[PDB]
Design a protein around this ligand. Structure first.
Ligand SMILES: CC(=O)SCCNC(=O)CCNC(=O)[C@H](O)C(C)(C)COP(=O)(O)OP(=O)(O)OC[C@H]1O[C@@H](n2cnc3c(N)ncnc32)[C@H](O)[C@@H]1OP(=O)(O)O
Ligand SMILES: CC(=O)SCCNC(=O)CCNC(=O)[C@H](O)C(C)(C)COP(=O)(O)OP(=O)(O)OC[C@H]1O[C@@H](n2cnc3c(N)ncnc32)[C@H](O)[C@@H]1OP(=O)(O)O
Ligand SMILES: CC(=O)SCCNC(=O)CCNC(=O)[C@H](O)C(C)(C)COP(=O)(O)OP(=O)(O)OC[C@H]1O[C@@H](n2cnc3c(N)ncnc32)[C@H](O)[C@@H]1OP(=O)(O)O
Ligand SMILES: O=C([O-])CC(=O)C(=O)O
Ligand SMILES: O=C([O-])CC(=O)C(=O)O
Ligand SMILES: O=C([O-])CC(=O)C(=O)O
Lengths: 156, 274, 274, 184
């Protein structure tokens, strides 16, 4: 039972990877669309400890928490339903399958390019079992103007 | 400077500094201006609470920080760091090079019993074991209990600055559990040997952990953060800096000359031909 | 150890240490044991008087030592030494290495206005010039008056922590001549420009020389010795150690990473082909 | 002084110092006098082998220590330790206080990749695993491989001082397996 709406002005995300240019582009887009809350709630980077990244909300400086595990990224944030997977081609599969074991995630945008077709079919099968809608691979993302933008879509 | 004053540009700042707003009308310490600091009669314990922990500590704890800086001042010139300060002061250096050259000895063997004696008793108390099992859990791993053990003064011969600190943390000091735990471990280890009283290094460690986690404004994940960061090595270094600068001014006042450490105290053990 | 115990041998000792008898029944400080230190309720100003000067200072001077250690604490992280402490803490070093690496900046240009502003006004007062000719003598030789001059706070807009020390000196000191001389030099140089008020770094210098040579137990050749030796460098370094350890604990608690200093703030000016 | 001269009172000596017998006719380094140091034409690599390791190192490795002290010289003033040296030198301090204030940054995050990148590869090689299992073991535990990764110049755009050292450890250098493991 996949959803029929995906992004809104209450939609938050978890960015999997240290992709601070894409996250800053998303936060700048959410400032220029007069949103009241930043659509990136946390970042997940498994190779560094839990800290906070210093980002820009228009003129102001805010702090977005970078976690190490996906579990405590889910535990501190119950409103997150999108995960933007910036992993490589050889680590997008197990990170995506790890994400779909969390119930709040309702859409997963896989940005990676070069995942093998068998692992992608396994991802399609488990996404149809869980009902999570996956954004087709080797994407740039998808932009919903006024509401939400996935990473590097649109551009600057 | 003009494209930022009219605000048409962003630049990400570094150096986050949640302490000491220097600019503006008054020097603001953590959230308190300098006139309120001198008006509320807080000593240097209050400004250690403001700079280091960023919380206005209650008046029984600022006086305890002043007390535990008075006892961790000079402990004679034979010890390792004060020896380095004297050696670097007799070589005619500077105040800051002498104090610095002696201060870089404060490590794990010299001056690292404050932090180790707080971490050991906190790991034994937050795990939840009885002291008669803590002593045997130490004894079956090597590792002498840090913070427990004196060379001379223990029992019917007290340390006389463990006693003053202990009287202060019993009178002006509500609900101190880890000190009671550490005194139970002292009750066991002084039954082992007539020595093995609580050190000053052990008692400031456990009384400082109880001061952090037993007063207000620290929850238990800040009172467990500041012990891991090293806010007790800060107490020992800031306390012993008065003793090291005292040794510098003293060796500069006696007009002592350069030290050379005679060769009959050295015993060279060089290889044959290599 | 046995030929000296039964006393049939001579060994000349080095390290003469007129401070802190560590061995025996108590930590004897200057001459005062540690229980007498905590019984007379002398704060850290009393133990600075005992360790640094070996004199039990009167109770208005220990409180002034604590005041001048409370104003010469942290002054923001922009300054050069606190910058070095932050840079060394963000490399994840130590408390001692971070405080030490920021402490070695306290020299002539950063924090060297205590000792220079004390020596300058003392050499002007002990020679005996009117301030109206001391200012003109300092203009004829280059050499700006150390301890006079601020960047923002000028006239009926004081530093607000030179006010606290000036009122404490004006109230609880008998016989304060050198502060009067330095305030006449302030009266002239604030007629030269709305700035050029007395610094904190200059008023602690002149009030500390005033407190040495004005109060008891210091004659005239001790109170002029401890200025040459550098007791005021000791006051600034011991005061700013709390600020630098506060910056270390702060940059260690915000979990900030290694500094790299962007290349567009650097401007390499290398030679052609060496 | 007189009772020990004719020997009538033993004293336990501390500071055991298995290096640099300073007293006598020649300043004897590790076991070798200063005239044998200068006559045998060993550079500073030979005296680092004598002072630090107390062995007379073979002549291809003294030049290697001179090589790896030449490449680990200055690497620009933007880095953290040279920044502290400049900040302390612009306060007009001293040579030893400036060098010292910048030297106290050589820790784990700055300058701590030499020792960690040696310990990591040595623990991986001593254990005895293939490199493809070593990369996957490091990936499974967090912990980026220390000693691997450049911000700009990597592949058919080399580092050009990894290349000089790599040519030296290939040419004048018998039986080098740990470098071959690190290159895998
Ligand atoms: C014109 C247009 O609009 S584009 C056309 C369509 N656009 C697209 O398809 C978008 C494609 N997206 C991309 O190319 C992006 O670069 C991405 C998302 C694939 C990022 O890929 P990468 O940069 O290679 O991933 P990443 O930065 O995390 O690092 C890759 C590997 O290096 C590893 N690594 C990094 N540092 C180290 C280190 N010191 N030691 C060991 N391993 C390391 C990482 O662990 C990681 O390992 P993994 O592959 O097993 O996960
Ligand atoms: C009249 C005459 O003089 S002759 C009489 C006839 N002769 C005799 O009777 C011989 C008597 N023999 C002795 O007295 C000897 O000194 C001995 C063998 C008993 C030595 O006894 P001790 O010095 O007390 O032993 P030790 O140095 O190990 O210290 C005792 C405990 O203190 C513990 N301890 C020491 N330091 C610490 C510390 N910081 N923290 C925690 N525990 C510590 C030790 O772990 C040890 O524990 P253990 O007993 O469980 O092993
Ligand atoms: C908008 C219009 O229509 S234009 C209006 C009017 N136009 C004008 O030309 C007015 C301009 N007037 C000004 O303000 C000019 O900038 C000036 C020249 C008067 C400014 O002069 P100043 O900056 O005060 O002089 P300077 O910078 O040398 O320092 C002032 C004094 O402070 C003293 N001083 C400075 N630093 C220190 C110190 N650290 N310690 C002690 N004394 C000090 C100096 O000895 C100097 O004395 P001097 O006047 O004998 O040299
Ligand atoms: O080790 C220390 O903390 C210094 C000390 O008190 C001693 O001289 O024994
Ligand atoms: O003490 C100094 O000389 C430097 C200082 O703190 C200031 O900027 O006021
Ligand atoms: O060895 C180090 O980590 C320091 C270094 O090369 C650099 O300048 O980036």
């Amino acid at each position: 039972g996949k959803s029929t709406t995906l992004f809104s002005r209450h939609t938050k995300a978890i960015v999997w990877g240290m992709q601070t240019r894409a996250v800053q582009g998303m936060l700048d887009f959410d400032y220029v669309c007069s949103r009241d809350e930043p659509s990136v709630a946390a970042m997940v980077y498994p190779f560094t400890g839990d800290h906070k990244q210093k980002f820009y909300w228009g003129h102001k400086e805010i702090l977005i928490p970078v976690f190490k595990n996906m579990a405590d990224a889910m535990r501190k944030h119950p409103e997150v339903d999108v995960l933007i997977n910036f992993a490589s081609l050889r680590s997008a599969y197990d990170s995506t399958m790890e994400t779909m074991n969390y119930a709040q995630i309702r859409t997963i945008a896989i940005i990676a390019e070069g995942i093998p077709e068998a692992l992608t079919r396994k991802l399609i099968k488990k996404a149809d079992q869980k009902g999570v809608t996956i954004i087709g691979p080797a994407t740039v993302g998808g932009i919903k103007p006024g509401c939400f933008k996935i990473g590097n879509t649109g551009g600057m | 400077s003009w494209a930022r004053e009219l605000g048409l540009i962003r630049k990400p700042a570094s150096f986050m500094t949640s302490i000491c707003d220097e600019r503006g009308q008054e020097l603001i310490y953590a959230g308190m201006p300098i006139t309120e600091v001198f008006k509320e009669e807080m000593g240097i314990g209050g400004v250690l609470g403001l700079l280091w922990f960023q919380k206005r500590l209650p008046k029984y704890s600022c006086q305890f920080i002043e007390m535990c800086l008075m006892v961790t001042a000079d402990h004679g010139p034979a010890v390792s760091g004060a020896h380095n300060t004297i050696i670097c002061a007799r070589a005619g250096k500077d105040l800051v090079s002498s104090l610095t050259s002696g201060l870089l000895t404060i490590g794990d063997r010299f001056g690292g019993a404050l932090d180790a004696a707080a971490k050991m008793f906190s790991k034994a108390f937050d795990s939840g074991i009885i002291p008669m099992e803590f002593v045997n859990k130490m004894k079956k791993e090597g590792k002498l209990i840090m913070g427990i053990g004196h060379r001379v003064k223990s029992i019917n011969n007290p340390d006389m600055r463990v006693q003053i600190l202990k009287d202060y943390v019993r009178q002006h000091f509500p609900a101190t559990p880890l000190l009671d735990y550490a005194l139970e471990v002292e009750k066991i280890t002084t039954s082992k040997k007539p020595n093995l009283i609580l050190n000053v290094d052990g008692l400031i460690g456990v009384a400082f952990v109880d001061m952090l986690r037993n007063c207000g404004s620290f929850t238990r994940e800040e009172a467990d953060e500041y012990i891991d960061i090293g806010a007790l090595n800060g107490i020992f270094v800031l306390g012993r800096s008065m003793g090291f600068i005292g040794h510098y001014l003293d060796q500069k006042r006696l007009k002592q000359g350069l030290y050379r450490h005679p060769w009959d105290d050295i015993s060279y053990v060089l290889p044959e031909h290599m």
